[PDB]
Design a protein around this nucleic acid. Structure first.
Lengths: 107, 109
DNA sequence: CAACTGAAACCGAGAAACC
DNA sequence: GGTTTCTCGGTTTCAGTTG
């Protein structure tokens, strides 16, 4: 299970706008969830790229780039994981710069 | 899995929907009315019934709770038919240009 | 942006595929 | 036995058109 530490590292790194902590206990955090158009095209997908690079699912100069399945893989991994739970009453999919709110369960 | 095909077959066989009829004996091709809501020949009840029925069958719409939106129901069903491999539209036989327009669909086995 | 459209992006729920 | 991807069967948004 490499998702937990990986995500925490990426949030602490802060190389991703919109990706912030929600409390000084480092337990709840936002993640930008915007709908792609035909292309907000690369800066947002960086996470979805990073993950695909980390788990070796995308190798630069070997595979064809494909942001939709990167975002989908991360979505399915975050939904099916047990270390993360969506605070649905806190998510905000109905604004400009929308996001989803997640709590990190202790383990 | 696979609810749309059987559901539409039962709807066609139900006779509850005027204009929703088989067009051959083998039950392989069928006609489905396709009236534009903005026109005057449009009966709200009868012409939205099938779309509403699909939006009820899948729990997307709930009576008394949600607010009715016939155009969403229409778009939902149309995109669904387009996506599925069980249904193929026969564009040269659909007549979306008469006073009572309709689409025609063939059921692939 | 009223109703409508095709195409693409999107989604959850199992079922594999990994680990 | 423990996580992450893949598949399937539709659904919803995007960028326009009046189908």
């Amino acid at each position: 299970g490499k998702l937990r530490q990986w995500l925490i590292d990426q949030i602490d790194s802060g190389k991703y706008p919109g990706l912030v902590w929600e409390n000084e206990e480092k337990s709840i955090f936002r993640i930008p969830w915007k709908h792609a158009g035909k292309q907000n095209r690369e800066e947002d997908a960086a996470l979805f790229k990073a993950w695909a690079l980390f788990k070796g699912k995308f190798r630069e100069g070997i595979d064809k780039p494909d942001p939709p399945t990167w975002k989908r893989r991360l979505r399915c991994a975050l939904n099916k994981s047990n270390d993360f739970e969506e605070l649905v009453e806190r998510s905000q999919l109905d604004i400009s710069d929308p996001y989803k709110v997640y709590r990190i369960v202790p383990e």
